[PDB]
Amino acid sequence: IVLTQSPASLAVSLGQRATISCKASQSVDFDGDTYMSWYQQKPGQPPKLLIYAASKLESGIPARFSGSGSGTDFTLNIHPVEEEDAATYFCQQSNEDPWTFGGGTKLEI
Amino acid sequence: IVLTQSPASLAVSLGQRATISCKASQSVDFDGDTYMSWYQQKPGQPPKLLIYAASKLESGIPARFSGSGSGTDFTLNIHPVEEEDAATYFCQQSNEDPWTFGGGTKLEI
Amino acid sequence: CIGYHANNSTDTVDTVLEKNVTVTHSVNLLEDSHNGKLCKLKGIAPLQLGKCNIAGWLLGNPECESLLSARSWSYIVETPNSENGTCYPGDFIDYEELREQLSSVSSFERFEIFPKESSWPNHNTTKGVTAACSHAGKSSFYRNLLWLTKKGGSYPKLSKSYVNNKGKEVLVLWGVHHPSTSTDQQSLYQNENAYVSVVSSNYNRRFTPEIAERPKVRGQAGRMNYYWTLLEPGDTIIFEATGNLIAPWYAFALSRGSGSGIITSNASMHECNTKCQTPQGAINSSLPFQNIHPVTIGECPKYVRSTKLRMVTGLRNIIEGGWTGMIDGWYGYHHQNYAADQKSTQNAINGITNKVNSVIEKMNTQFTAVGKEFNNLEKRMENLNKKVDDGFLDIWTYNAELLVLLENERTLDFHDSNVKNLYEKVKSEIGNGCFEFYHKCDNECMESVKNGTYDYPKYS
Amino acid sequence: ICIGYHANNSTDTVDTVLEKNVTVTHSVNLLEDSHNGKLCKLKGIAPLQLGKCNIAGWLLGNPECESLLSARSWSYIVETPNSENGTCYPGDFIDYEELREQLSSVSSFERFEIFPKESSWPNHNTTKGVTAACSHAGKSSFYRNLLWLTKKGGSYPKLSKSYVNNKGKEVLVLWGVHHPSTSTDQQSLYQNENAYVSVVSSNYNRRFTPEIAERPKVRGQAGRMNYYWTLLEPGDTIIFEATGNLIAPWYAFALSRGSGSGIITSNASMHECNTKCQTPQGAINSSLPFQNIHPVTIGECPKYVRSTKLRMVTGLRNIPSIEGGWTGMIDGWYGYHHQNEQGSGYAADQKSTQNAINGITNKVNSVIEKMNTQFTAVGKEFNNLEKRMENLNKKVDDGFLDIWTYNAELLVLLENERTLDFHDSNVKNLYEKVKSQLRNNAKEIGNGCFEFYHKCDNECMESVKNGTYDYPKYSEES
Amino acid sequence: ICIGYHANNSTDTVDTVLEKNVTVTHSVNLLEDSHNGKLCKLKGIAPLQLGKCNIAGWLLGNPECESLLSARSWSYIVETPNSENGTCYPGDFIDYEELREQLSSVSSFERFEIFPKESSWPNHNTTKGVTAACSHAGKSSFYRNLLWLTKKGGSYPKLSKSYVNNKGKEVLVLWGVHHPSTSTDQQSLYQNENAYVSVVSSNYNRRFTPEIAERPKVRGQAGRMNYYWTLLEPGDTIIFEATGNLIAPWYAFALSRGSGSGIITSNASMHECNTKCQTPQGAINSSLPFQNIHPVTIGECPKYVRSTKLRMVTGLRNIEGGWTGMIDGWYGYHHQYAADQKSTQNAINGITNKVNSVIEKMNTQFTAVGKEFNNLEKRMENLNKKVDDGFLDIWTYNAELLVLLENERTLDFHDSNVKNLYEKVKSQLRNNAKEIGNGCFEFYHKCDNECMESVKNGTYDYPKYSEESK
Amino acid sequence: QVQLQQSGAELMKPGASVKISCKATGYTFSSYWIEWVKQRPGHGLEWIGEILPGSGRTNYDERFKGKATFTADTSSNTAYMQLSSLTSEDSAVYYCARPRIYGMDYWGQGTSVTVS
Amino acid sequence: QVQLQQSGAELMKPGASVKISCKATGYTFSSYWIEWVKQRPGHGLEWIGEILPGSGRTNYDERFKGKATFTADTSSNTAYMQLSSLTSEDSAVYYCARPRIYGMDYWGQGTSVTV
Ligand SMILES: *[C@@H]1O[C@H](CO)[C@@H](O[C@@H]2O[C@H](CO)[C@@H](O[C@@H]3O[C@H](CO)[C@@H](O)[C@H](O[C@H]4O[C@H](CO)[C@@H](O)[C@H](O)[C@@H]4O)[C@@H]3O)[C@H](O)[C@H]2NC(C)=O)[C@H](O)[C@H]1NC(C)=O
Ligand SMILES: *[C@@H]1O[C@H](CO)[C@@H](O[C@@H]2O[C@H](CO)[C@@H](O[C@@H]3O[C@H](CO)[C@@H](O)[C@H](O)[C@@H]3O)[C@H](O)[C@H]2NC(C)=O)[C@H](O)[C@H]1NC(C)=O
Ligand SMILES: *[C@@H]1O[C@H](CO)[C@@H](O[C@@H]2O[C@H](CO)[C@@H](O)[C@H](O)[C@H]2NC(C)=O)[C@H](O)[C@H]1NC(C)=O
Ligand SMILES: *[C@@H]1O[C@H](CO)[C@@H](O)[C@H](O)[C@H]1NC(C)=O
Ligand SMILES: *[C@@H]1O[C@H](CO)[C@@H](O)[C@H](O)[C@H]1NC(C)=O
Ligand SMILES: *[C@@H]1O[C@H](CO)[C@@H](O)[C@H](O)[C@H]1NC(C)=O
Ligand SMILES: *[C@@H]1O[C@H](CO)[C@@H](O)[C@H](O)[C@H]1NC(C)=O
Ligand SMILES: *[C@@H]1O[C@H](CO)[C@@H](O)[C@H](O)[C@H]1NC(C)=O
């Protein structure tokens, strides 16, 4: 399985939403439950996950991060957008064994 | 509900079978039970129930009074008629709440 | 002289050695009297089903409208002539288990789990009425159930959820209607391949209508099987049906209790305030045995099949015989120059009065022992329950009879042994029971000898 | 005069709380230990001997048990442990154990043609309904109570048969559903693959659907037949309708309900008797309260206790086989050696002896009445998914058995102690009466024996015995 | 020659039916009320501690019970009250309590690969059958004893897998049936819409079909898995024919039957010891007939009686009067305080017979392990509870009544045996002694201490010691 | 033996009010409904409504809403129907009948109301 | 709570074997897996493999198998990595992460193996 993030690079303005989409060769949904996680990696720092199961925010996260989509298509939009979260974003699938990560995408103010 | 009847007037000689047709706008049999009644009314007297459930004969009513039919087709057959049978005949449905009656038919000798 | 009391009493007792013995006193332990009168227990009036049974009461039978206001009760009463239940032919699935659960509950609250006007917009609720469930002249239907037919030729798949926020268990009841013809199935629920799915978080059953030609019961060739389930607090039950669903109109928030039960009785209901209640009639008694009826509610004496359980308190009413002349004491001291009593035997009398308390307390009281109901496919378990009840009843009957017989024998040996001991103490002579004295013994001397300390060598 | 208690030569041993077993003169063995070992008639009705057939094969009319087709009435039902021939076609007799429990109560029935073969089914092929598994006389056969229906000329019309119970008694109707191993076999037997069996009544409603799958061979058959039953009430109607896979009923049994019947699993032979009680080991008859032969009994039988020896004490303890009894003086229970110059004979105190014997007989009669003649308590078989209920029934039976064993043993010990002390107290008070008859006119041997200073003749001493003699009559101090 | 009975400074008090709280010289307590809380080994075989898992989790192979799949033999099964791992995927274990009862009598099994994962289903899928509900170590997993088969590359051919029980013992086969929440999920796992599962043996026959419906979430899953089981007799064949929805067997258990085992719920700790009785509260090493520790027992154990005190009166009462001068035997005579040895030995032998008979009468209770029922078996559960409570009341009453009867009998025995000794001593010689009235009859003629020997042995001659009192 | 007595003949000017009386005998008055049906020449028999005695629950035909109001007196076993603001269009003969499931078996003698 | 500590950055000659130690504190070491992932510059993170401490199971990715060899020491509460035959292509930052069902959490510090 392979994950593809679109767009590769995107520019955003403060307070306006930035939509990031992930595409998979095979559907990552098994028995209704969908395995897809969204990570953000500030440079020089470990990637930090935002959404697990593609819709459920983890504890201790701002509400601007949001997850949606199922099957092959998934999307990530943050409303609004702050100056802090200018890091690279990753979508990772947990369905197949290799646990492939997405290509990554750049989010710039 | 609307419950029509035919003929408006019936002219049957003594000793001749008399058939009266009552038709319904909507089916009056719910769950395999036909809610249909047959009355006779001497002038100036309350109607008397003759056939209930469109086929069952009332107690105290002779075997001459017989009816049948189901759904939207109902017939009451009188044989052999007598001088006492000259009365206005009513068909009534009990399936709908308005419990609407029929028009009433005059049977002569 | 030394002897034993004999009164005019004629209460008879039985023992192992001989039967039908006569003693001066007795204390019955078998209460064989019933008020014949239903009374409230612990100040809570019962629930009288009357002409209905539990199925008719819970389903909402049209002839049980007096029970729709019932909230609390001490014990359910259904008369033997109770046939208003399940007006539409069909079988209540796990009916007896439902009665078992209902015996535990002490009160509930009937509420609209799915309000009839609000819950079903796409289904047609006014149509469903049957002549089998006839109230007054007009035909009617169960008050707690709702019969949903197709609205305008369509029966879209309904999916209704309820979240048990009542904080207590909720008894949900529904039904699956099995018509008699495929034409009826299409005329009521347009989908012929209908199904009913009722899935809770611990209940999961799917039902399918079975159209067949059947003998007419109550004028109906169709059948309606009724089902039930208990919804735990904070749980969701989902009703999904494509047809043949008798939806739950009302449910019950069960407040569980203990000591209540279901009794079938004929006794009329009036006002009392008792602690025990058999179907024959409410009773109270401090006696630890009753033969009125095995089925009891509340604090009741043990049930034995015997007809007479009489302890022995008095001495042999009929060597010295009975002292008819002295009624003052169980024991006498006749004086030549009336019988008197001694303080050394009141302790023995108190010991016997303690002994009767000991035997009555060693028979722990029986609690609610309502009978169980079984269907025609549970004759093995029904006979096992019958064997268990009859074996325990026989064992406790035998235990009661042994206890009374051995106790009467032991206490009669007591009434002889204490008399002989008193004879020895008086000694410490005519063998009939009197004491001839060579020396002149005045009434003061007689009292001194009654004290037991007499200087016999003084006379010499 | 010497007064004491009789001793006998008998060496019977009893049990008491004092000792583990001691010798007495007389006893009554409350525990019956003998069984005839032959099955026998119970109140004039010979039982039903299923032989090699079990209940299932007999009801279905298995080809082997042809002798049971004529049977009408029975006192009880006997199935030998080696009997194994029932449900010749492999399958599952649904609620078979409930059917056995139902048949326990019935006292007789009438096997009648509920649906005659030659009239009920004109549009179906009743001729071929035989299989090799139900083989009889070296030929392919079937049950004699069921009919295996099949398509008639490549067609199986929707069947519909109704029976109205006009026998006045509940009727046991048995049928079956066939599950072919392969769909092609279903088509070859019945026209339509989506077949169903619908059996309905006023109190019975059940729809059966054949399930086709490959199966391990049992008795050479890769198919399965499920056999069902129902109890049609009098005046009721049962409707059999089936588009396929119906083993239609042929004979039904109008059950006559009875009581006191039961099923036993004995292996003993049969012989003509007439007994009020019966156990699988053999017919017994005894008025004793207890028996250890077998827990399963039919009719009025003694109680069952595991105890090996159990007997009341109806005989005073004897020193030979107030120290000691008198060995050769068998005249009475309570005797006295009357010594005199005229004669030195012996006689028994009649009134005390009769009082003792009537008291002891009253006690043993109370013991026998306390126990209740155990009604027919036969075992019940259970499914392989009913080990909980089976173990509960086993625990109940074991507990009641243990409780009654303990009760019987404790009653034996307690009554033995009481009657021993009763005999001793009787001797003591007899001696009390003896020395109350005369005082200071006679010296004391002890041990209940007396000798007189003055010479008192045999008639004088007889007057002494009844208490009509007075001390001041003789004033011989020495 | 004063004849009495021995007394001691013992606080042992007992009850009689006539009166309660009477002090006695010696008593034997037949109710054992102590226990070491540790769960010791029964007959040298360690138990099986389910720990965090119930029977369903242990047998299905729950991922969190991986230390229990090495089990081969045990004496009994211990499931703690906190044993809540079982059936990680939501659903119903069909006839689960029946399986518990079957497992109670099992003494050991050999868990084995009934259908090897790598060679049983080549035309199916075995890898992607994992759930978030059965997660182990923070990753999706599944039961270690079952295999969730899904379609292999968009196809789910009808499977027909057979096993022949050549193990020589009954084999416990467990499988499951999956009911997906939506028809698209069923299509995505098992391409066939109208799937079924058929499991047929010589004794067993059952067909299962999926039931797709909307269900409330339990453990995050809106689907359901139903778990079944069957006991395969030796030399028998079991055939699985599934078109879909089959959680195929992977490991089965060749059952070796036993006796005396059972399943208990205990809150105790496993510690190295050996015992012949093991209640959930602790082990028992006692020969006492009755115990009140706990009704549920394993092995040979005393009878359980709800009472709290059960003491037989071995020794006579203590306070004629009680004299401590005689110490050799229970009964003696005061000679200027010499205890006897004949009557006291006879009474001791009799009382030992009494007490051993009481112990003999009560057969030791065997393995009375409780049973479990579901929410549709309230009637069977109530009947079982009624049976248990009835037997408990019956045996408590029998024990208490026998203790009271034996107490009264023993007190009568001793209080009459002292009188019997007095009576025989006074029967040795008559009119040669004067009874003062306190149980002491002393001769009108003075004797040396040796003159008491003629009364001690019994042989007395009145004429040789006949004089004039006045 | 069940009988349903009715009042006599009454007449009022248009715009008046009339309390038509029905008296039921021989059975529990509250047990069965009491149906009201209107008959006019050339128009047949028309159902006015129903009232369950004692319970107080009642139903009305839509065309008679407000025109007809039902009340019951279970003490006297009498059922009363009220017509408010009579008009010349509402002159007929009124019956009180005991319903059965399929039809009304027992009726009353009937009362006729005029508008002059 | 839970902290993952890696070895410091280190450079090593090509063709040799480098050991990378991951320190797990605050939880039972054998309870959870340890996922090894490397982030090449200009490329997405690639899952190397995963090792459960107690069981010793190691699920190597097909691409990175043989190149890496996971080992763990329960006594030290760490799990190591064995990269042999290093190359500038193999050079990247490496991460040990404690996985949850849908994705790894608590990640780690990171370590570079520049060649
Ligand atoms: C609440 O209970 C009451 C009774 O306490 C119950 O009323 C009963 O209804 C049944 C069903 O209609 C009646 O039984 C019928 O009675 C009529 C009139 O006598 C008979 O004609 C019927 O006979 C037919 O069926 C028989 C077979 O059963 C045939 O043999 C016969 O030829 C007929 O075909 C049938 O017996 C019963 O009489 C009444 N009883 C009373 C006292 O009214 C009521 O229905 C219950 N209510 C609810 C809501 O369930
Ligand atoms: C009546 O009872 C007899 C005896 O119980 C039945 O005969 C038994 O029939 C079965 C099946 O036909 C035999 O089983 C077979 O055994 C052979 C080995 O001998 C095996 O290779 C086969 O696969 C099969 O299992 C069984 O041996 C045989 N027993 C005897 C003693 O003959 C008979 O079938 C019963 N008839 C009816 C109608 O119930
Ligand atoms: C169907 O019925 C016929 C007779 O009604 C059975 O008998 C066979 O009939 C055919 C055609 O008449 C003959 O060729 C055969 O020789 C007859 N005997 C046998 C044993 O086949 C026939 O067996 C029945 N078949 C089924 C499947 O029930
Ligand atoms: C004792 O009296 C009762 C009641 O009068 C009687 O039933 C019984 O037969 C009597 N017993 C004897 C032994 O006479
Ligand atoms: C429901 O069914 C009845 C038939 O009795 C019909 O009159 C009504 O219009 C239907 N629809 C609603 C919304 O009640
Ligand atoms: C309870 O017993 C007492 C004493 O006999 C009696 O007076 C009272 O009436 C009984 N209780 C009731 C509710 O009758
Ligand atoms: C263990 O569980 C039992 C069960 O009720 C409880 O009584 C006991 O207190 C528990 N032990 C501890 C240490 O909590
Ligand atoms: C039980 O206790 C006795 C006490 O002496 C001891 O000898 C015996 O070894 C113990 N047995 C076990 C199994 O603990």
PDB file of C-alpha atoms in Angstrom, chain C residues 293-364:
ATOM      1  CA  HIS C 293     -50.139 -23.259  52.600  1.00  0.00           C
ATOM      2  CA  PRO C 294     -46.580 -23.776  51.308  1.00  0.00           C
ATOM      3  CA  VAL C 295     -46.652 -20.568  49.250  1.00  0.00           C
ATOM      4  CA  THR C 296     -45.992 -17.630  51.575  1.00  0.00           C
ATOM      5  CA  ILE C 297     -45.021 -13.964  51.277  1.00  0.00           C
ATOM      6  CA  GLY C 298     -42.853 -12.292  53.901  1.00  0.00           C
ATOM      7  CA  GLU C 299     -42.009 -13.433  57.410  1.00  0.00           C
ATOM      8  CA  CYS C 300     -43.923 -16.684  57.899  1.00  0.00           C
ATOM      9  CA  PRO C 301     -43.713 -19.844  60.004  1.00  0.00           C
ATOM     10  CA  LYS C 302     -42.257 -22.966  58.456  1.00  0.00           C
ATOM     11  CA  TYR C 303     -44.703 -25.107  56.488  1.00  0.00           C
ATOM     12  CA  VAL C 304     -45.149 -28.759  57.455  1.00  0.00           C
ATOM     13  CA  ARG C 305     -47.782 -31.272  56.404  1.00  0.00           C
ATOM     14  CA  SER C 306     -48.469 -32.292  60.009  1.00  0.00           C
ATOM     15  CA  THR C 307     -51.745 -31.589  61.794  1.00  0.00           C
ATOM     16  CA  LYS C 308     -50.631 -31.276  65.439  1.00  0.00           C
ATOM     17  CA  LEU C 309     -47.312 -30.005  66.831  1.00  0.00           C
ATOM     18  CA  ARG C 310     -47.659 -29.623  70.603  1.00  0.00           C
ATOM     19  CA  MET C 311     -44.777 -29.214  73.014  1.00  0.00           C
ATOM     20  CA  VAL C 312     -45.167 -30.500  76.560  1.00  0.00           C
ATOM     21  CA  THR C 313     -44.896 -27.905  79.302  1.00  0.00           C
ATOM     22  CA  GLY C 314     -46.978 -29.509  82.046  1.00  0.00           C
ATOM     23  CA  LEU C 315     -46.413 -32.630  84.093  1.00  0.00           C
ATOM     24  CA  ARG C 316     -48.369 -35.849  83.671  1.00  0.00           C
ATOM     25  CA  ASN C 317     -51.922 -34.744  84.455  1.00  0.00           C
ATOM     26  CA  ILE C 318     -53.138 -38.314  84.970  1.00  0.00           C
ATOM     27  CA  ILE C 319     -46.575 -43.835  93.986  1.00  0.00           C
ATOM     28  CA  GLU C 320     -47.942 -40.305  94.279  1.00  0.00           C
ATOM     29  CA  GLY C 321     -50.462 -39.148  91.690  1.00  0.00           C
ATOM     30  CA  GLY C 322     -51.738 -35.738  90.679  1.00  0.00           C
ATOM     31  CA  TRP C 323     -52.506 -33.160  93.379  1.00  0.00           C
ATOM     32  CA  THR C 324     -55.965 -31.937  92.249  1.00  0.00           C
ATOM     33  CA  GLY C 325     -56.345 -30.065  95.553  1.00  0.00           C
ATOM     34  CA  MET C 326     -53.330 -27.790  95.046  1.00  0.00           C
ATOM     35  CA  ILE C 327     -53.411 -25.564  91.922  1.00  0.00           C
ATOM     36  CA  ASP C 328     -50.812 -23.160  93.409  1.00  0.00           C
ATOM     37  CA  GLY C 329     -47.695 -24.893  91.999  1.00  0.00           C
ATOM     38  CA  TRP C 330     -46.344 -27.614  89.674  1.00  0.00           C
ATOM     39  CA  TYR C 331     -45.088 -29.159  92.917  1.00  0.00           C
ATOM     40  CA  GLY C 332     -46.713 -29.458  96.317  1.00  0.00           C
ATOM     41  CA  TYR C 333     -45.863 -29.844  99.997  1.00  0.00           C
ATOM     42  CA  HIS C 334     -48.897 -31.339 101.730  1.00  0.00           C
ATOM     43  CA  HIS C 335     -49.089 -30.596 105.459  1.00  0.00           C
ATOM     44  CA  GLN C 336     -50.728 -32.781 108.091  1.00  0.00           C
ATOM     45  CA  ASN C 337     -50.828 -30.019 110.719  1.00  0.00           C
ATOM     46  CA  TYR C 338     -52.100 -27.647 102.155  1.00  0.00           C
ATOM     47  CA  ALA C 339     -49.573 -28.109  99.355  1.00  0.00           C
ATOM     48  CA  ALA C 340     -46.964 -25.361  98.988  1.00  0.00           C
ATOM     49  CA  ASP C 341     -44.295 -24.494  96.423  1.00  0.00           C
ATOM     50  CA  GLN C 342     -40.509 -24.266  96.378  1.00  0.00           C
ATOM     51  CA  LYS C 343     -38.165 -21.753  94.770  1.00  0.00           C
ATOM     52  CA  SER C 344     -35.741 -24.476  93.631  1.00  0.00           C
ATOM     53  CA  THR C 345     -38.071 -25.561  90.796  1.00  0.00           C
ATOM     54  CA  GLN C 346     -39.026 -22.183  89.321  1.00  0.00           C
ATOM     55  CA  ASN C 347     -35.569 -22.241  87.729  1.00  0.00           C
ATOM     56  CA  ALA C 348     -36.387 -25.575  86.071  1.00  0.00           C
ATOM     57  CA  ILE C 349     -39.705 -24.164  84.848  1.00  0.00           C
ATOM     58  CA  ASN C 350     -37.826 -21.175  83.419  1.00  0.00           C
ATOM     59  CA  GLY C 351     -35.402 -23.604  81.792  1.00  0.00           C
ATOM     60  CA  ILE C 352     -38.294 -25.323  80.031  1.00  0.00           C
ATOM     61  CA  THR C 353     -39.680 -21.938  78.964  1.00  0.00           C
ATOM     62  CA  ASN C 354     -36.220 -21.201  77.564  1.00  0.00           C
ATOM     63  CA  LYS C 355     -36.189 -24.596  75.863  1.00  0.00           C
ATOM     64  CA  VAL C 356     -39.379 -23.911  73.922  1.00  0.00           C
ATOM     65  CA  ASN C 357     -37.809 -20.641  72.778  1.00  0.00           C
ATOM     66  CA  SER C 358     -34.703 -22.590  71.755  1.00  0.00           C
ATOM     67  CA  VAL C 359     -36.658 -25.072  69.645  1.00  0.00           C
ATOM     68  CA  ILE C 360     -38.748 -22.352  68.002  1.00  0.00           C
ATOM     69  CA  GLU C 361     -35.640 -20.277  67.199  1.00  0.00           C
ATOM     70  CA  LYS C 362     -33.757 -23.295  65.832  1.00  0.00           C
ATOM     71  CA  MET C 363     -36.476 -23.408  63.138  1.00  0.00           C
ATOM     72  CA  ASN C 364     -35.406 -20.455  61.016  1.00  0.00           C
TER      73      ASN C 364
END
